Amino acid sequence: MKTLVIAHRGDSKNVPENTIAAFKRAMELGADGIELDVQLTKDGHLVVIHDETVDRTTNGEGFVKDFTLEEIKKLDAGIKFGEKFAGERIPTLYEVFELIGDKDFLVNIEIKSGIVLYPGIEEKLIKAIKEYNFEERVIISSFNHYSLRDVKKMAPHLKIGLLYQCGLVEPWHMALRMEAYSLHPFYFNIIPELVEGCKKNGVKLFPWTVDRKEDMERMIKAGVDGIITDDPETLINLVRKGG
Amino acid sequence: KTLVIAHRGDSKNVPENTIAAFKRAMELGADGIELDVQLTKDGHLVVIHDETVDRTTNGEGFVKDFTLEEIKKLDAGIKFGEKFAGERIPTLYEVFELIGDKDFLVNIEIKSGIVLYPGIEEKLIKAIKEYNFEERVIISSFNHYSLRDVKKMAPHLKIGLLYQCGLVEPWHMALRMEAYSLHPFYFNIIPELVEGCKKNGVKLFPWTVDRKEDMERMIKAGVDGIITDDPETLINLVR
Ligand SMILES: [Ca+2]
Ligand SMILES: [Ca+2]
Numbered sequence: 001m002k003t004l005v006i007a008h009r010g011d012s013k014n015v016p017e018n019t020i021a022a023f024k025r026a027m028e029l030g031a032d033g034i035e036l037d038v039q040l041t042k043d044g045h046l047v048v049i050h051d052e053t054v055d056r057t058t059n060g061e062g063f064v065k066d067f068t069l070e071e072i073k074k075l076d077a078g079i080k081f082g083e084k085f086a087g088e089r090i091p092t093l094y095e096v097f098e099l100i101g102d103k104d105f106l107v108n109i110e111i112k113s114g115i116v117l118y119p120g121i122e123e124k125l126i127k128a129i130k131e132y133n134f135e136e137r138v139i140i141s142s143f144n145h146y147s148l149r150d151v152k153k154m155a156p157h158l159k160i161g162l163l164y165q166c167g168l169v170e171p172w173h174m175a176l177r178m179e180a181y182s183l184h185p186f187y188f189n190i191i192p193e194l195v196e197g198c199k200k201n202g203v204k205l206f207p208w209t210v211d212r213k214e215d216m217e218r219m220i221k222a223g224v225d226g227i228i229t230d231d232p233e234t235l236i237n238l239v240r241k242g243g
Numbered sequence: 244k245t246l247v248i249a250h251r252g253d254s255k256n257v258p259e260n261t262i263a264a265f266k267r268a269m270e271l272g273a274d275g276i277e278l279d280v281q282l283t284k285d286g287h288l289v290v291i292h293d294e295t296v297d298r299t300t301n302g303e304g305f306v307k308d309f310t311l312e313e314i315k316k317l318d319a320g321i322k323f324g325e326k327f328a329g330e331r332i333p334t335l336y337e338v339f340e341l342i343g344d345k346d347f348l349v350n351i352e353i354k355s356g357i358v359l360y361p362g363i364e365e366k367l368i369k370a371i372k373e374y375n376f377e378e379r380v381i382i383s384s385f386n387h388y389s390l391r392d393v394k395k396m397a398p399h400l401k402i403g404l405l406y407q408c409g410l411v412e413p414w415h416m417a418l419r420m421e422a423y424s425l426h427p428f429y430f431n432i433i434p435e436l437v438e439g440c441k442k443n444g445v446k447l448f449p450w451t452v453d454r455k456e457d458m459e460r461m462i463k464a465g466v467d468g469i470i471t472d473d474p475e476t477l478i479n480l481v482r
Binding site: 113115142143144145146147149163164165166167168169170173174177178188 | 355384385386387388389406408410419430
């Protein structure tokens with residue numbers, strides 16, 4: 001079967017990352033899903049943005065956790081990438097679910113693991129996913145596997161993906177013990193031994209971030225379940241073999 | 244009983260990964276040093292962190308593209324300060340020669356990343372055997388496949404599993420790979436990790452801890468060693 005194309009922060013190569021515009025473009029291109037990052041505002045709302053600070057992607061400055069939802073919505077998350085995207089905002093998580101609707105589109109949600117701690121984010125994320133009936137279409141990932149352990153304990157039916165860059169040997173044992181749906185390794189880790197071990201144990205593989213054509217071709221040949229990429233258009237054409 | 248491991252020598256005060264930095268670490272009274280090994284074009288073991296010489300030296304390009312003769316022409320001290328002008332990128336042999344017979348630990352990290360170094364594991368074990376550093380060395384790497392090869396070729400050598408990933412119950416992985424220690428990013432040091440490692444006889448070497456307050460928390464947590472850019476502050480804190 002075809003490898004799934006997961007657009008990293010939407011079609012981030014051509015559209016401002018982590019915006020409804022970028023996620024919508026990924027859907028239009030024919031991607032199988034999207035990868036996104038969730039954080040909490042000061043008043044406890046789930047917003048979609050990668051960095052702990054709004055500095056890089058917006059016309060504002062300061063930590064995401066210091067902004068209230070109303071305040072963070074005044075920022076422009078599109079202008080830093082192009083004049084054509086002026087006025088594009090930092091989405092809430094609800095907006096992403098509302099954009100997709102009932103469509104069969106995978107949403108790989110990453111809970112952050114940096115210096116900024118997010119108390120109660122697991123409970124809030126679980127409630128939001130259940131409210132919009134996205135239980136089956138979501139994979140909750142994180143580099144903080146303790147957070148995923150809490151998610152699995154509080155909502156066993158939700159799928160968790162273990163993100164890692166570390167060059168782990170036989171990581172499928174850990175994955176099975178944590179009841180993880182998938183392993184999300186930095187693409188350098190994708191080698192025959194890892195693929196075979198995961199396939200023999202039913203553990204899915206979602207390598208990231210694959211942007212170069214040569215690496216995309218190797219990931220498809222390796223036979224991974226899905227590829228997280230900033231360039232869905234190029235990967236889709238390779239996966240579809242020009243069709 | 245908490246080991247002071249100087250990250251790239253006394254890198255806060257002296258240019259990183261240089262004989263001068265390692266010598267300063269020895270003089271301050273540190274228990275050991277942490278360093279990175281890479282191979283030159285002609286297959287010599289040299290001590291430098293980045294896969295390119297750009298940041299720490301006055302040269303440009305990948306380490307693997309420099310032969311030992313060409314890489315010795317570079318100044319690995321001037322960028323840190325004028326006082327250290329002339330300081331060179333050391334070979335692993337020079338580090339062993341500087342330490343000599345002193346009971347000083349050498350945490351050697353085999354570089355992973357993009358560049359592959361064929362036969363680096365064999366060259367490392369032979370160099371350690373040639374200078375009789377078998378018991379004074381802990382070989383670490385983010386690439387655990389490299390450490391699996393080291394454990395097979397030389398079981399007597401201690402291996403440390405480096406990771407930044409927030410791993411749950413990593414001592415199972417440690418025991419499976421016959422690892423002497425786990426080298427976690429120091430954010431990962433929590434009661435659950437320490438207790439689980441101590442119960443299973445796996446040691447902990449958190450990295451890199453530079454803030455005095457963080458050093459205090461690591462000592463109170465009960466870690467076996469602390470990898471730090473500032474050995475002086477940690478040594479004076481233990482005192
Ligand atoms: Ca992410
Ligand atoms: Ca290192």
